Design an enzyme around this catalytic site. Structure first.
Site, PDB file in Angstrom:
ATOM      1  N   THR A 108       0.832  -1.195   0.000  1.00  0.00           N
ATOM      2  CA  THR A 108       0.000   0.000   0.000  1.00  0.00           C
ATOM      3  C   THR A 108       0.869   1.248   0.000  1.00  0.00           C
ATOM      4  O   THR A 108       1.944   1.261   0.598  1.00  0.00           O
ATOM      5  CB  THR A 108      -0.953   0.034   1.229  1.00  0.00           C
ATOM      6  OG1 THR A 108      -1.973  -0.953   1.070  1.00  0.00           O
ATOM      7  CG2 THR A 108      -1.611   1.405   1.407  1.00  0.00           C
TER       8      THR A 108
HETATM    9  O1  LIG Z   1      -4.066 -11.762   3.645  1.00  0.00           O
HETATM   10  C1  LIG Z   1      -5.157 -11.717   4.105  1.00  0.00           C
HETATM   11  C2  LIG Z   1      -5.659 -12.768   5.091  1.00  0.00           C
HETATM   12  C3  LIG Z   1      -5.720 -12.255   6.525  1.00  0.00           C
HETATM   13  C4  LIG Z   1      -4.327 -12.405   7.125  1.00  0.00           C
HETATM   14  C5  LIG Z   1      -3.933 -13.631   7.636  1.00  0.00           C
HETATM   15  C6  LIG Z   1      -2.662 -13.781   8.170  1.00  0.00           C
HETATM   16  C7  LIG Z   1      -1.794 -12.700   8.182  1.00  0.00           C
HETATM   17  C8  LIG Z   1      -2.189 -11.473   7.663  1.00  0.00           C
HETATM   18  C9  LIG Z   1      -3.465 -11.322   7.137  1.00  0.00           C
HETATM   19  O2  LIG Z   1      -1.275 -10.410   7.693  1.00  0.00           O
HETATM   20  C10 LIG Z   1      -1.346  -9.613   6.547  1.00  0.00           C
HETATM   21  C11 LIG Z   1      -1.249 -10.147   5.264  1.00  0.00           C
HETATM   22  C12 LIG Z   1      -1.333  -9.303   4.164  1.00  0.00           C
HETATM   23  C13 LIG Z   1      -1.487  -7.937   4.355  1.00  0.00           C
HETATM   24  C14 LIG Z   1      -1.583  -7.413   5.630  1.00  0.00           C
HETATM   25  C15 LIG Z   1      -1.507  -8.250   6.726  1.00  0.00           C
HETATM   26  C16 LIG Z   1      -1.603  -6.982   3.171  1.00  0.00           C
HETATM   27  C17 LIG Z   1      -3.097  -6.649   3.056  1.00  0.00           C
HETATM   28  C18 LIG Z   1      -3.379  -5.556   2.044  1.00  0.00           C
HETATM   29  O3  LIG Z   1      -3.208  -5.772   0.893  1.00  0.00           O
HETATM   30  N1  LIG Z   1      -3.887  -4.279   2.504  1.00  0.00           N
HETATM   31  C19 LIG Z   1      -4.186  -3.216   1.571  1.00  0.00           C
HETATM   32  C20 LIG Z   1      -5.417  -2.464   2.076  1.00  0.00           C
HETATM   33  C21 LIG Z   1      -5.266  -1.291   2.799  1.00  0.00           C
HETATM   34  C22 LIG Z   1      -6.392  -0.616   3.251  1.00  0.00           C
HETATM   35  C23 LIG Z   1      -7.661  -1.110   2.990  1.00  0.00           C
HETATM   36  C24 LIG Z   1      -7.811  -2.289   2.271  1.00  0.00           C
HETATM   37  C25 LIG Z   1      -6.686  -2.959   1.812  1.00  0.00           C
HETATM   38  F1  LIG Z   1      -6.820  -4.113   1.100  1.00  0.00           F
HETATM   39  N2  LIG Z   1      -3.824  -7.802   2.570  1.00  0.00           N
HETATM   40  C26 LIG Z   1      -4.832  -8.466   3.391  1.00  0.00           C
HETATM   41  O4  LIG Z   1      -5.089  -8.089   4.485  1.00  0.00           O
HETATM   42  C27 LIG Z   1      -5.549  -9.654   2.768  1.00  0.00           C
HETATM   43  C28 LIG Z   1      -6.784  -9.116   2.062  1.00  0.00           C
HETATM   44  C29 LIG Z   1      -7.432 -10.067   1.074  1.00  0.00           C
HETATM   45  O5  LIG Z   1      -6.756 -10.741   0.378  1.00  0.00           O
HETATM   46  N3  LIG Z   1      -8.878 -10.122   0.982  1.00  0.00           N
HETATM   47  C30 LIG Z   1      -9.717 -11.080  -0.039  1.00  0.00           C
HETATM   48  C31 LIG Z   1     -11.058 -10.933   0.234  1.00  0.00           C
HETATM   49  C32 LIG Z   1     -11.165 -10.137   1.557  1.00  0.00           C
HETATM   50  C33 LIG Z   1      -9.741  -9.416   1.714  1.00  0.00           C
HETATM   51  C34 LIG Z   1      -9.881  -7.958   1.257  1.00  0.00           C
HETATM   52  C35 LIG Z   1     -10.640  -7.091   2.029  1.00  0.00           C
HETATM   53  C36 LIG Z   1     -10.798  -5.771   1.652  1.00  0.00           C
HETATM   54  C37 LIG Z   1     -10.192  -5.316   0.495  1.00  0.00           C
HETATM   55  C38 LIG Z   1      -9.430  -6.180  -0.277  1.00  0.00           C
HETATM   56  C39 LIG Z   1      -9.276  -7.507   0.100  1.00  0.00           C
HETATM   57  N4  LIG Z   1      -6.025 -10.630   3.720  1.00  0.00           N
END
Ligand SMILES: O=C1CCc2cccc(c2)Oc2ccc(cc2)C[C@@H](C(=O)NCc2ccccc2F)NC(=O)[C@H](CC(=O)N2CCC[C@@H]2c2ccccc2)N1
Ligand SMILES: O=C1CCc2cccc(c2)Oc2ccc(cc2)C[C@@H](C(=O)NCc2ccccc2F)NC(=O)[C@H](CC(=O)N2CCC[C@@H]2c2ccccc2)N1
Ligand SMILES: O=C1CCc2cccc(c2)Oc2ccc(cc2)C[C@@H](C(=O)NCc2ccccc2F)NC(=O)[C@H](CC(=O)N2CCC[C@@H]2c2ccccc2)N1
Ligand SMILES: O=C1CCc2cccc(c2)Oc2ccc(cc2)C[C@@H](C(=O)NCc2ccccc2F)NC(=O)[C@H](CC(=O)N2CCC[C@@H]2c2ccccc2)N1
Lengths: 222, 215, 218, 218, 218, 223, 222, 223
Positions: free
Chosen positions: H1
């Site tokens: 991000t």
């Molecule tokens: O990786 C995951 C699983 C949760 C998890 C498990 C273990 C460690 C961990 C996180 O630890 C982590 C693993 C990965 C991250 C953080 C922490 C990076 C972070 C990110 O990209 N974050 C960008 C971002 C910022 C602000 C708002 C929305 C948004 F997606 N990604 C995430 O949390 C990802 C998100 C993801 O794939 N999904 C698919 C369907 C729903 C969810 C989504 C929701 C809303 C918008 C876009 C997507 N979840």
């Protein structure tokens, strides 16, 4: 520490050493470890000094507490059970090094046979209790040397005075082999403490008599 | 106003119907004498080493207070030291306790209490006697305390026939005589705080020894 | 509601009128407490803190409860902050709050009347402060004296005539004993006397008993 | 029910009617509080927050309890959010809720009448606000002045024809003291303070001693 | 206040007086309990501990609660200390405290009359003890007999005539039944009989039913 | 730290050094570790500074709190027990590095013999307490050096002044061998503190008398 | 962070640097670490930024809360105690990396001698407090360098202006040797902040004065 | 991000990328990370997607909750404090991987001078908050690349339009070096989102203006 207790015709004797240690260092020379808990009961405690002191103090107030509340002292079995419950309640702290191990000597005024009213009870860190029937018992880091010394000397116990001398000699043998048990100090004039209990109750043994027995034992050894 | 007047009336009337108790200082310490036909249920008791307790009124209620004072005295002696327990502070806590009971309990206690202290062994100190009434009023008395029943005849009889440093026999007959104006071994509970005892001063005078003391 | 609270007021006023009297006055060395008290061990005057004293009239167990509560409050405040942060004013303030709550909420109102007095700290010059707190929580700041318990008005007017600022200890003791006798013989056997002595280094409270008191009564 | 609330309302109204009088009024420099008070240690006017002041009439222990609760509410509010988020309107609103709950639920209603005043922050132009909260939780917004305690109508009418917007501190003080005279007055019998709109942050400041005498003379 | 406890004592008096009668007597073999009970499974006399027995008169569920509570107390006390530390004096003391609390604090006082009795332990010669505890916590220990429920004074005076200390078993049973009919024919269908037999090695309580009981009434 | 206490005929003396440290670094030079806890009692504490100062202040409040509530001070045995219970209640925090080890010196107004009315009580981290009977005691990282020094010096204790001199020399020996104990600072004019307690009560020893005794010890050892 | 405080005749000075870091990375150039806690007290805090800021804000509210409740400010000793209690209550979080280490400067209006009524109190992470008696103190990762600089410079302190100059020079030496303490920033015109307290109360020192002193030090050492 | 924010004469701009990842895998291409949290503030959040979204939603509810209860919005400093307390309360979960790191942009209608009424507040995982005074900030895995880009471009900011262009370019540079930050997707027509706040309040920037700026940036980098 070594605390000994032995039965003689018509009574019981308990004697204890005077030493406290902090590891290898000697930190006390006149500790009194044998307590008159009530008119017919004495307790000697080994272990962590703070816990042992606190145990003897609180056990005595608990026994007198019951007596004043109910108008009659506890049966000897009741006194045993309360001391066991106290040790059992300390078990968790005892596993962390706050250990108290008591030894109970007494004269049961409600005994079935008035000639054999002497009582010796030993305990373990779990609160277990065992009424000793072989006439003597000990507790502390020298208890094995003291019990083996008494195994050989107990045949000489014919009255309260010979029982006292045997108890003092058992403490002498324990100090001989256990550096955590203190022997007679002829320079400072410090000797084990003793309590004798018969039908007339429990009384502190005068230091002059213990000193006499200790000097005789020392001369017979040398 | 009417609630507290009715509570005071219930307590006063309940105590007026109870048997009488006397405590007085003598040469050997303090002497408690109470009219008690029972052989096992007691109105006089030890509280601590040199501190005694006597009560008149409803048994279950002053027995609750007797046990409560014992719990207090043993707790304080253990949390600090035995010598820090005094008759004054025991009477003080009884006044606080009875005040609370009188104002807040479902029924006030029909009790009147005496706390007495003699000197520890080897020390010369005048005995102390405290009277604590059902409402927590506390009185400091120098020679004797009377509680339960009609107190005026007993108190006056003691007021003229009391001798300082009197013997145990003389104090005992003065007490029984004062109680008569209101009596044998079977109808008396007698005990003393004996200032000559080494630690526990409380001792009951019962049966044959009591008979010898009366005759 | 209106006569229920007036009945509580009368119960408390009657209880205070039936008890013996207490006087607290400012003299040259601090504050003098003189109370009629025949008991040898039960006290009506007491130390609260380093420079703060306590005097009460009424039912013993009730003003003793408040005495103990005041010591608890003072000690807690001095420990939680610093000793010098404890003042007679805030002790009177919390006594007023507590008695106000008791008078309205407890089963029976407290038949008590309290005086809290404070003298200057050692080496500092500041006129003694005297506070009166009555059974309902009303609080009054007096400059010269406070009378409590029993028939108060004759004692108050006797002090109104004979009081003089910065009087000696013996003069103040005479005036106080005389004013007390006006309200009702009084000797060491029937008196409880103590002072807040502004010349003490830390704890100003000290009692005057026995030989010393007899010597100051002559 | 309706008689219970009439009795409680009457007890409180009488208690306030038997109390000394306080007025607060807006003037050119902020808000001025004057009250009839002979005490030299007890106070009926107090700071609540940076630009918010407090004045009360009635029983001391009760409005001191409310003064303390208001200080607790303001300090907690300004800490959880920010200092500028605390306003006099909020505190008046809290007092209204508090007094209403006290009036309907406590064993005895509070015999108090409260004024909460707020002035502008430093460098801002804003009319002072004055809130009156009565013993039952009723709350009123006032633009010129507030009178509380005792016999109010003589003081209120005296202020009515004599009140001048943007008056000097000296003028407004004399007006207020004269209005107090219409009911039940020198330095020894007055507690006076101001919410000074020109102070940078803590607007509250007391006027006592020689400065109060100088403002009283001319 | 007086009216409350007056009506409570009145309610308990009527309930106990309406119920059937129970007697306990000290005899040469220990203590004997005789009660009028036409039921086959609902018991008024009961074991409490090794040498301690229990008898009651009044409302069944209420003295059954008290019977169970005494069993909890004695079993808990004997486990926490030792069996021989449980005494009849102790259990009677606890019943006095318990009924006192019930009489003053519960919605309705208990309409019960309790007798606690203890006989000597096996091989010992100790005088039996009987205790009577009334609905308000009043307790008295008797030397010879205890009467409860119904019209007591006829039975009490009848026993006062016909009691012999250290009498026979069948002698005391017929004495008790004769005193019971004074307030026309009482057989096995009308009686509940048990004894604390000082000759049993530990559990002295034993019931007498049917054939044996009838044999004792010839 | 080293706190010492010793009995003399008629009373007791307690003295303590002025140093605090953080690791090897010296963090304080005028720390006062010996507190007059009431009119006949002095307490000296070693260990974690924060805990030590809190123990002393709370303990003095506790004793005065009882005196004012009950009208009488605690017996000396009551004072021992309250201090021991305070240490016991800290045992868990002490195992995590918040240790306070006090030493107690007092004058028992209710003792039998007024010339043996001096009292010295040592403690351990579990709340243990032991009334000393051999006349002296110490606590802190230099306490073994101090006790072994007082063992050889105790015979010259005949009154309050000679008792003070021995206490100061024990502290000097403690600081001689223990870097966590401060010796006299002649450049800054900082010396150990001391309290003497007799029948007339507990009093702070003036800095001047301690300074004179320290200089005497110093030049006696320098030649 | 380095925060310094020193006494001068009739007052006290506190000065602190402007840097915050996140590891090796510079995360702040404008941080204000020295707070006027009340009219006669200034607090400077080193450690974790979130905690330090919260400590300063909560402490000032607590002091004013007492003054409004009680009509009088706390004694200076009471102020010391409340800050110590705040730090002690944070000890567990401090062991988890949420550390606040304050330094307290004040002017006691109730002291006897106003010339020496300035006060400096240092603290540790267990809530220990020590009133400094040698005239200066410092807290933070650069405090050793600042205390050793002030040791050599304190003789020059004769009044507020020279006390301020020494304080600024100590902060300069700290930043010279400690990369976690920010030096004067001439490009951006960012300089340490300072509070000076005397009998008239505490006042923020104008940035222009600190700029003058900073440039003089830089000019001198070139 | 990456989320950037910068001040321009009379307002602030905040812009964020559109990417979510699950390890190396791209899990989202149109994520909206910059939320209008009230009429005058925007919040952009990096970290765990679930926590970031819940934070923005709860925070906006809390501000509107206060406004309706009290009849007035919170001061800007009050808004900062509530956000910081929210982040602080999530510290334990954040240490378990449920991390939310907000960046706050706002326009303070109560500010002294309306030209610099813009506000940029950065936060850390302990709930620390710092009002930024150098004109711009960023948060997220690409924030270093974005801030270093804005360091060189910020002098070109003279109005709202050039401020938006600099923010868009900063996001472009962040995605150029940080694979967890999404760049402009000309194939799908997906571009960073942006919010602009001035005296008239906070408004979303039309994607078509963002697209035009991104395409111009791409053209200039191409030659
Ligand atoms: O990786 C995951 C699983 C949760 C998890 C498990 C273990 C460690 C961990 C996180 O630890 C982590 C693993 C990965 C991250 C953080 C922490 C990076 C972070 C990110 O990209 N974050 C960008 C971002 C910022 C602000 C708002 C929305 C948004 F997606 N990604 C995430 O949390 C990802 C998100 C993801 O794939 N999904 C698919 C369907 C729903 C969810 C989504 C929701 C809303 C918008 C876009 C997507 N979840
Ligand atoms: O070692 C310690 C410190 C506590 C501790 C820490 C870590 C491990 C540990 C015990 O674990 C232990 C370490 C050492 C022991 C047990 C556990 C042996 C035990 C002992 O000698 N016990 C003999 C003894 C028996 C009964 C009554 C009193 C008495 F001293 N020693 C102890 O506890 C020693 C005792 C000691 O030095 N002091 C000095 C002043 C007060 C205390 C004392 C009280 C009362 C009487 C005599 C001394 N404390
Ligand atoms: O080391 C520290 C920090 C707390 C800590 C962290 C980690 C381990 C630890 C202790 O574990 C420890 C580290 C160090 C020690 C113990 C435990 C030795 C002990 C000491 O010298 N103690 C002597 C002493 C005895 C009684 C009264 C005061 C006094 F300082 N030192 C300490 O605790 C030191 C003391 C210190 O530097 N400061 C600076 C300003 C305030 C505080 C002070 C208060 C009061 C008086 C003099 C100084 N704190
Ligand atoms: O490094 C971090 C991450 C938070 C954290 C969590 C757990 C352990 C930890 C650090 O571990 C740590 C990492 C780093 C430190 C301590 C602990 C040093 C400390 C510091 O510089 N402190 C100087 C300072 C002193 C007083 C007041 C403010 C101030 F910044 N730095 C920090 O905490 C940094 C601070 C930081 O970057 N930000 C950016 C926006 C908000 C916050 C800030 C607030 C206020 C003013 C300036 C900056 N947080």
């Amino acid at each position: 520490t070594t605390i000994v207790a032995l039965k003689y015709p018509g009574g019981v004797v308990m004697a204890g050493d005077r030493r406290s240690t902090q590891g290898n260092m000697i930190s006390g020379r006149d500790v009194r470890k044998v307590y008159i808990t009530d008119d017919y009961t004495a307790t000697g405690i080994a272990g962590t000094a703070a816990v042992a002191v606190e145990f003897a103090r609180l056990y005595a107030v608990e026994l007198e507490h019951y007596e004043k509340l109910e108008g009659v002292p506890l049966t000897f079995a009741g006194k045993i059970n309360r001391l066991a419950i106290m040790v059992r309640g300390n078990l968790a702290a005892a596993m962390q090094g706050l250990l108290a191990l008591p030894l109970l000597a007494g004269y049961d005024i409600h005994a079935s046979d008035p000639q054999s009213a002497g009582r010796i009870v030993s305990f373990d860190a779990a609160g277990g209790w065992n009424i000793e029937e072989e006439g003597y018992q000990a507790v502390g880091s020298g208890s094995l040397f003291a019990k083996s010394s008494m195994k050989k000397l107990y045949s000489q116990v014919t009255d309260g005075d010979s029982g006292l001398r045997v108890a003092v000699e058992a403490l002498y043998d324990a100090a001989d082999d256990d550096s955590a048990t203190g022997g007679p100090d002829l320079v400072r004039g410090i000797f084990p403490t003793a309590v004798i209990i018969d039908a007339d109750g429990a009384v502190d043994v005068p230091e002059s008599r213990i000193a006499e027995l200790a000097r005789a034992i020392i001369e017979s050894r040398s | 106003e009417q609630a507290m007047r009715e509570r005071s009336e219930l307590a006063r009337k309940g105590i007026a119907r109870a048997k009488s108790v006397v405590a007085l200082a003598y040469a050997g310490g303090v002497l408690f004498v109470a009219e008690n036909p029972s052989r096992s249920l007691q109105k006089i008791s030890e509280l601590y080493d040199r501190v005694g307790f006597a009560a008149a009124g409803k048994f279950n209620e002053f027995d609750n207070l007797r046990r409560g004072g014992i719990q207090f005295a043993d707790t304080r002696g253990y949390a600090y030291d035995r010598r820090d327990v005094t008759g004054r502070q025991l009477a003080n806590v009884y006044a606080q306790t009875l005040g609370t009971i009188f104002t807040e309990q479902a029924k006030p206690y029909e009790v009147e209490l005496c706390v007495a202290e003699v000197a520890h062994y080897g020390e010369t100190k005048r005995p102390e006697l405290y009277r604590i009434t059902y409402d927590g009023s506390i009185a400091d008395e120098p020679h004797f305390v009377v509680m339960g029943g009609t107190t005026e005849p007993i108190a006056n009889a003691l007021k003229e026939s009391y001798a300082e440093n009197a013997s145990l026999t003389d104090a005992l007959r003065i007490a029984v005589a004062a109680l008569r104006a209101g009596l044998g071994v079977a109808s008396l509970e007698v005990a003393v705080l004996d200032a000559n005892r080494p630690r526990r001063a409380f001792r009951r005078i019962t049966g044959s020894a009591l008979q010898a003391l009366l005759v």
